Enzyme design. Structure first.
Site, PDB file in Angstrom:
ATOM      1  N   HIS A  12      30.066 -67.331   8.487  1.00  0.00           N
ATOM      2  CA  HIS A  12      29.119 -66.324   7.987  1.00  0.00           C
ATOM      3  C   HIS A  12      28.146 -65.737   9.012  1.00  0.00           C
ATOM      4  CE1 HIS A  12      30.375 -67.149   3.930  1.00  0.00           C
ATOM      5  NE2 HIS A  12      30.082 -68.429   4.073  1.00  0.00           N
ATOM      6  N   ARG A  20      32.233 -52.120  12.188  1.00  0.00           N
ATOM      7  CA  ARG A  20      32.452 -53.100  11.147  1.00  0.00           C
ATOM      8  C   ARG A  20      33.401 -52.504  10.128  1.00  0.00           C
ATOM      9  NH1 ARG A  20      26.262 -53.101  10.545  1.00  0.00           N
ATOM     10  NH2 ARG A  20      26.581 -54.107   8.514  1.00  0.00           N
ATOM     11  N   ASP A  21      34.584 -52.148  10.620  1.00  0.00           N
ATOM     12  CA  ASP A  21      35.602 -51.461   9.830  1.00  0.00           C
ATOM     13  C   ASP A  21      36.612 -52.515   9.339  1.00  0.00           C
ATOM     14  OD1 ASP A  21      36.654 -52.075  12.399  1.00  0.00           O
ATOM     15  OD2 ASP A  21      37.816 -50.198  12.580  1.00  0.00           O
ATOM     16  N   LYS A  39      40.828 -66.068   2.481  1.00  0.00           N
ATOM     17  CA  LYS A  39      39.645 -66.130   1.619  1.00  0.00           C
ATOM     18  C   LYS A  39      39.510 -64.757   0.927  1.00  0.00           C
ATOM     19  CE  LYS A  39      35.176 -68.438   1.972  1.00  0.00           C
ATOM     20  NZ  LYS A  39      34.107 -67.410   1.915  1.00  0.00           N
ATOM     21  N   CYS A  80      34.023 -58.753   3.870  1.00  0.00           N
ATOM     22  CA  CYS A  80      35.423 -58.576   4.039  1.00  0.00           C
ATOM     23  C   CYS A  80      36.092 -58.994   2.740  1.00  0.00           C
ATOM     24  CB  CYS A  80      35.909 -59.418   5.220  1.00  0.00           C
ATOM     25  SG  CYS A  80      35.083 -59.037   6.775  1.00  0.00           S
ATOM     26  N   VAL A 102      19.661 -61.803   1.680  1.00  0.00           N
ATOM     27  CA  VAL A 102      20.779 -62.729   1.475  1.00  0.00           C
ATOM     28  C   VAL A 102      20.317 -63.992   0.748  1.00  0.00           C
ATOM     29  CG1 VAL A 102      21.838 -61.800   3.518  1.00  0.00           C
ATOM     30  CG2 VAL A 102      20.646 -63.977   3.709  1.00  0.00           C
ATOM     31  N   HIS A 113      25.229 -72.868   3.177  1.00  0.00           N
ATOM     32  CA  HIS A 113      26.017 -72.192   2.182  1.00  0.00           C
ATOM     33  C   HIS A 113      25.515 -70.769   2.053  1.00  0.00           C
ATOM     34  CE1 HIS A 113      27.922 -71.414  -1.689  1.00  0.00           C
ATOM     35  NE2 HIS A 113      26.744 -70.988  -2.114  1.00  0.00           N
TER      36      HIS A 113
END
EC number: 3.1.27.-
Length: 120
Positions: A12, A20-21, A39, A80, A102, A113
């Protein structure tokens, strides 16, 4: 040492992306070992680590829900999301860049986490 913190960074954290494609997502998901099985969704946080760790304290977080923390500051993130039918490689991803606070879980002042629900 906290193996969950190290795993947190692997799963993460990505300090300095450029683009960031989709192809960013496909590469980093393979690079951080998150592709067998694929994932379904995974979010990376960008910027510095001190800001992320600071969520575990009052400086940049508040308690949230059941023993989680929510950040005061907003972060550049990239989500993603897996598409196609198959759980197995090649894993195709749609990238969604974002900028918001976040939700993490902390242990011993360290994030261990990331709450993914806010990004799906």
């Amino acid at each position: 040492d906290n193996s969950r913190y190290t795993h947190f960074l692997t799963q993460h954290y990505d300090a300095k992306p450029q683009g960031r494609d989709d192809r960013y997502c496909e590469s980093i998901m393979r690079r951080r070992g998150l592709t067998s099985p694929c994932k379904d969704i995974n979010t990376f946080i960008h910027g510095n680590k001190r800001s992320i760790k600071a969520i575990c304290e009052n400086k940049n977080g508040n308690p949230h829900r059941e023993n989680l923390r929510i950040s005061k500051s907003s972060f550049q993130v990239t989500s993603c999301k897996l598409h196609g039918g198959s759980p197995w490689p090649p894993c195709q991803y749609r990238a969604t860049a974002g900028f918001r606070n976040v939700v993490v879980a902390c242990e011993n002042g360290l994030p261990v986490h990331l709450d993914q629900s806010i990004f799906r």
